[PDB]
Design a protein around this ligand. Structure first.
Ligand code: HBI
Ligand code: HBI
Ligand code: HBI
Ligand code: HBI
Ligand code: HBI
Ligand code: HBI
Ligand code: HBI
Ligand code: HBI
Ligand code: NA
Ligand code: NA
Ligand code: NA
Ligand code: NA
Ligand code: ZN
Ligand code: ZN
Ligand code: ZN
Ligand code: ZN
Ligand code: ZN
Ligand code: ZN
Ligand code: ZN
Ligand code: ZN
Lengths: 194, 84, 194, 84, 194, 194, 194, 194, 84, 84, 194, 194
């Protein structure tokens, strides 16, 4: 079952308490002026960053529409996406590019974006995020094909560790005719550019 | 069921080898040791084996099939066999 | 039958009345200085945005010219297009790119643009608009092939809902040789770039 | 009418399978359960069936046809059959 | 008094009714498949575009903080903004650039953006919007100076009337030292660029 | 006294404990495969993001060199900087541009960058960070003037709250001749561009 | 008195006759397929390029509104403009940038554009065009100041004569405070850029 | 036979006469200061825009050179081209990109450009212009293949009619290997870019 | 002259079908109803017919030709026939 | 030497036709009127004729060869002949 | 007296003889196929590069027009210029930017470019070229001020000697108000940019 | 045998003499201050531009190294190249892009550049220069394939003749697998871009 507003109320305190704990463990003074409301703000923020858990793809995946009259490639590019890597709990941000070729069912353009929000607002791994978005579209439309590309900057690779600024991670899922047909894949890849 | 179509992708010296669609001879598929699956993105089921196509060709010989034609389409190699 | 100038005169008052009603229902004061002439300006504006309904492709689709001496790709790119999504009545704007390979008939360059104006100036859905443009060119010229790409920003996705600024919707229709021949499609897709 | 040309796009384990042009044998087309259509963009009519090519090959066997050659052109698979 | 959620419920039906009327007055069929839920989607969207009326600067203008230790220029540029021109009820969109030199009081960065949202989310005129943002910051902080620049595209000038695509409207308010000191104004103007 | 490696060892368990608690309070399963080592990775990451507390400007501020022979503007632009806002514990990232006009003392170029690292790797507020950098350079060199500009993206304004992508916060401190002389400030502002 | 629709009807045949004469004098065959309707298309086109003669600034210059509450700079940049140089009857095209500081009167943004159309749509000289636009705004508003910049490509300089491709002609008029105040002029010049 | 300098002298007066007539028919005063010499300047200009008629491809198409030692693709890109649409007698301008693979004969680089000038300086249609350039190169060299791409802005589509600024027309002719070999065409298409 | 090579581009259910080069049997070309042309860009002449390849294959059957092999090269379909 | 491989590029109605490698039958190459060359870029020698492939196929018939298979690889057309 | 067409004929053989000699002195074979006509082509080319000597500013500087009604800045930027440095006889190429503020006399836009051609088409030194252009405009118009900027690449500095590719020489002449008034100079410098 | 330093000394006087002759034949005064040393500077310069004649590919082509362990594409792009066209003795400049796939031999990266220098510094024709570079690499390495692309601006086409500024000449040689394999050629072409 998805997370609920009630769950957030019951758990908000525990989160706030943990963040307060973190502040002291870092050497900071949780009493300090600009740090007083931080435990609640940090908690509220973390809950927002993970609000995808309180939603289920079922809802959105049920608003598909029958239409076999639009044999054309549909792309929704540059969808801003913000997520949290599950490994370090630091965010990774960037853009998602979706494209599909319908068979008999189509999906509302805004619904595609909502699929991205439901999965990106969770503790994630870029490869899983990509696949989940692609699988969602596949299962909701049974399309001829679908393509999903994600370009993002992982803060845990820029702010720490290997510390490679400029560095970006790109993940790409090509299904159906997007994988089989060279003309199809090349088209999507061009249309999502610049 | 005289005609058969099998294929393999990219490189031939290794499998998997696709050996059938949904309406394929269940017995023949079993004789080949093929499993049925539905790869993500495809709106259909397929029968495949981990054997390279050469091994699958020899097995089909035993069941009385002969290669009539072989062609490449994209990076996929396809064989058209007939029950002779 | 297509809408007429007479139809617009008879309906202008009703539109004006409806918009005036909207102002009140929103909490504004229709009497307020800068809102007085608004009901008429809004109505007149909305009629302009849908002036495509008072035109029929028939007129334009009858100015095709016989010519089998020009075996070359013809492209008219970056055609500015403004339309209203039929779902929220908010406009979506962007560009249309058209390309075709003639058989025996050609179409005047400006006429291609007029085809875009007739369909884009109506309550629309981007996929339908794309197809209608492509179908018009196909039926008027029986070309070897045709390609139509539309790149637009849907205000209803930027100003509200999923609220994804930067986000763009691209629809692509490839017919005939534009779909069959990889050389052809790649060329159109390159020639319409930057 | 000895020669026949049929084809299928992208993936073979699923239809549709194109089985004829405008001047194709109406009876043979009917036997195959084919419908006539003119896809947007094409300046010609075609006969097609929702069956994968394998099923169509077996059906043509019954009507006395034999595969002479099979080839790939683009992402389309084509079969040249002869009335033998 | 500001608009309320109750006001929106009571008025939603009338709005929907007005939009339904508009559809008919335009020549469309409100029964047509993709136009059924339009009257409500349009109403809900128009309420969202005007949600600024249900908020009061008072709330946000009461979270100023005392601080005379940060004598430096503070700028929040590229704030996305979406508004509706009160004259034609078509949206004008673009960006807002804010800057100020504090005296003894500072304002939280996110709060500057919220000021933009409260005023932009209404039927507007670019000049008024600009001034309202500037005045809010002025009255909340009594700063040494403040600057507000708004760059936006007015759809009613692109999609109709003079029909000037590419055309943009820029409004600029310079107060206090931002007006008096050439060094100050030049700095703000440079730092808000590209 | 500054934080120490010993302090980090003693506190790591509590940090890990707090993050583990956060995972449960969010609705996740700390046992789940990709979340097992998260409590430690997150803690270690957070200690790295705040490693500035274990350093004191004193050290670096004692490697100033006497030199009154170099009367020219010294600028170190595009210094990558990664910090954590103290309000939401979400990072804000961007660039720092430093410039100064020496009197009799100069500072090694790399040292200027180290000043940014000591102060940015702490829980911060962009205005404070800016001033601290400026003040350090001032106290270490008694220069004729100094300028510090910071351009950064606050994830807590992009990923949540006002949710303004594209939005950037610029803070600028001009001291000495950088404030008094218009020629000086204009030069610094130009030389740090593109 | 301004030109009229009647005038255009009476004069259309002579224009058509003149263009037909030109075709013969150039060595072409006015009978040739793609040249048959040319005399009328050329004439009609030329009348459109000069439709400014059938309008008077008076009309537009009377829609000025009293408003002394918006002391801010108003700019409308990138106004597309197409004109015909009176010397060779070849067109010169580019953009117009307008700006002003009001005293007690303001002008609708779209009205500024209409001023550009009235004068640009005539046989012109870039300097005169610039001045007329400026003078109109001045006489209609009595502003504190006004600036008008025009950037255009003269085809008669690219396609012939000195044949300098890439070459552009910029004309700039600065009146009132736009001329006197260096802070004002610099601001306008910056805000109309890129 | 091509036009001659004598032909231009005999016809100059008639042209001048026709343009003078056009001035009157438009509402202007041919006596007015800046319009006195216009009838001659326009006529002279129009003769220059059509000077291609006084040249024959034969001349240039006879300076081919035997050379089967240079089996490589030769491209001359970004050739500025100015022409006049025969439909409205308004100019269309842009660039021409030429490419070919020789067999046994080569053509001087400058000669390729001269071919463009001969055909572009006439009353034209973009498709015809493209073909003529391509046909010329073919007949002069019997190459393995040739490609000609023209990108231009039609003033009759920007300054009037559909009035689509930004709009461009691209025509592409691919012959021989340029049409048959996908590697060849893709290479030419890349090498003529940016 | 036992060997023959014919081809068709892009789609098979419609012509034109290329049926010969400069040195092709004039009589056979005439029997097929083919015309000779030199398309701009090509440095050679060709014989073609507006019939789809299927119709041309049946006609060649009558003149004693048999399809030995069929292949795709690019977007062009080619048939190799032998006088048998 | 029973097997032979010949090919032609881009368009079939015109030569050149590649008819052999370094170890090809010198006599057969001479009978075909083939010359040996090493095109710049290739690290091997080749035998070619200016005749279209059809002409070369007829010549090979006379020397007792039969087309076993024909295929397209890239924009190159290839024929596999056998001494039968 | 300026050079004449007769002079060019009499001297063409000597030039050709000199170039023929140079070829031999370099180690080349003047008999070699691609070098046969070189002596004449080089000679003719060099005469064209120096065709400025056969013209006198007098002619062009006598087409000034009285006009004290256009008090605005006139700029003709990006004038392509090609010259030969007198030191090594290698060409230097780039652009010239001209601007002026008239008093009572104006100059035709094309005439400004002609001034550039007369002087650039000689053996030169960038500083001299710049001044000559400025002095010409000054003596022809007695303007309130004039500015001339030249940005060029000297091949003798890229292809040899210091061999600095990317390197560019800029020369700037500011006269009258362009020198005295900071507002004026800044405007010119901005309007000639990008 | 290659040219030598001795050859340059013996021939310098004749060159100088020829250039001095050219100065007089152009109408200049060789005695004039800035032209005195010109004859020697021009001569020395021309010798430098043709210094490739005093080198032989043999030297460089003998520093190949055996290595069959690096099966990967090696590219050296954006190699600056300056040459003189043999037709007019005017320079053509641009860049050279080299790529190759080794078999058993490799070449040092700087050595590739030297190959470009030996051939480009001679009187040349772009097509020949391209082939010579490719042939050299081919004969020195017996690679699987090689690609060479040259993009240059010919001054004799910009400064004179067809006078097409912006115009560029691209020559491309693809050998071995670069010609046969579409994947290979497309890769090289992409990796050498922007
Ligand atoms: C088989 C069929 O040709 C394939 O599914 C399609 N591909 C494409 C398509 N439309 C576009 N724009 N691009 C494609 O690659 N419609 C259908
Ligand atoms: C079959 C025929 O070769 C095909 O329809 C064509 N393609 C093309 C063409 N022209 C261009 N420029 N590009 C093509 O892909 N003319 C004809
Ligand atoms: C009077 C005082 O010097 C003036 O108000 C200030 N100007 C500025 C400042 N800080 C910056 N960055 N820029 C200014 O123009 N601090 C204070
Ligand atoms: C007073 C003295 O002229 C002033 O402190 C200086 N200013 C500057 C300088 N150097 C530069 N580059 N810029 C300045 O503004 N050196 C000294
Ligand atoms: C005198 C008065 O300060 C002056 O006219 C003004 N200038 C300006 C202004 N507002 C802006 N933005 N810029 C100015 O230069 N308001 C008023
Ligand atoms: C058949 C042969 O491969 C074809 O004519 C050629 N193509 C090309 C070539 N050279 C280049 N650079 N690109 C080609 O596509 N030389 C010859
Ligand atoms: C003295 C007088 O104000 C000065 O000569 C002028 N300067 C300028 C002007 N116009 C512009 N655009 N810019 C100036 O700097 N007109 C007149
Ligand atoms: C036959 C073999 O696959 C071919 O020669 C190769 N091509 C390539 C290669 N490596 C790259 N990067 N690209 C190629 O196209 N190594 C070997
Ligand atoms: Na495989
Ligand atoms: Na299929
Ligand atoms: Na066909
Ligand atoms: Na061939
Ligand atoms: Zn991580
Ligand atoms: Zn919508
Ligand atoms: Zn409006
Ligand atoms: Zn924060
Ligand atoms: Zn003119
Ligand atoms: Zn036209
Ligand atoms: Zn020099
Ligand atoms: Zn040359």
């Amino acid at each position: 079952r998805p997370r609920s507003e009630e769950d957030n109320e019951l758990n908000l305190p525990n989160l706030a308490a943990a963040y307060s704990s973190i502040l002291r463990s870092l050497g900071e003074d949780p009493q300090r002026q600009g740090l007083l409301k931080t435990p609640w703000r940090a908690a509220t923020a973390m809950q927002f960053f993970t609000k995808g858990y309180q939603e289920t793809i079922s809802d959105v995946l049920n608003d598909a529409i029958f239409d076999e009259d639009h044999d054309e490639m549909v792309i929704v590019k540059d969808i801003d996406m913000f997520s949290m890597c599950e490994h370090h709990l630091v965010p990774f941000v960037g853009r998602v590019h979706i494209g599909y070729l319908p068979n008999k069912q189509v999906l509302g353009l805004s619904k595609l974006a909502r699929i991205v929000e439901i999965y990106s607002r969770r503790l994630q791994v870029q490869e899983r995020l990509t696949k989940q978005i692609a699988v969602a579209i596949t299962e909701a439309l049974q399309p001829a094909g679908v393509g999903v590309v994600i370009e993002a900057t992982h803060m845990c690779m820029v702010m720490r560790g290997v510390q490679k600024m400029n560095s970006k991670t790109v993940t790409s899922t090509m299904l159906g005719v997007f994988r089989e047909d060279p003309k199809t894949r090349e088209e999507f890849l061009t249309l999502i550019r610049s | 069921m005289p005609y058969l179509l099998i294929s393999t992708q990219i490189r031939m010296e290794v499998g998997p080898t696709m050996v059938g669609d949904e309406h394929s001879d269940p017995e023949l598929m079993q004789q080949l040791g093929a499993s049925k699956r539905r790869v993500l993105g495809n709106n259909f089921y397929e029968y495949y084996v981990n054997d390279p196509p050469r091994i699958v060709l020899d097995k089909l010989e035993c069941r009385g099939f002969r290669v009539l034609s072989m062609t490449g389409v994209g990076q996929t190699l396809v064989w058209c066999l007939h029950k002779e």
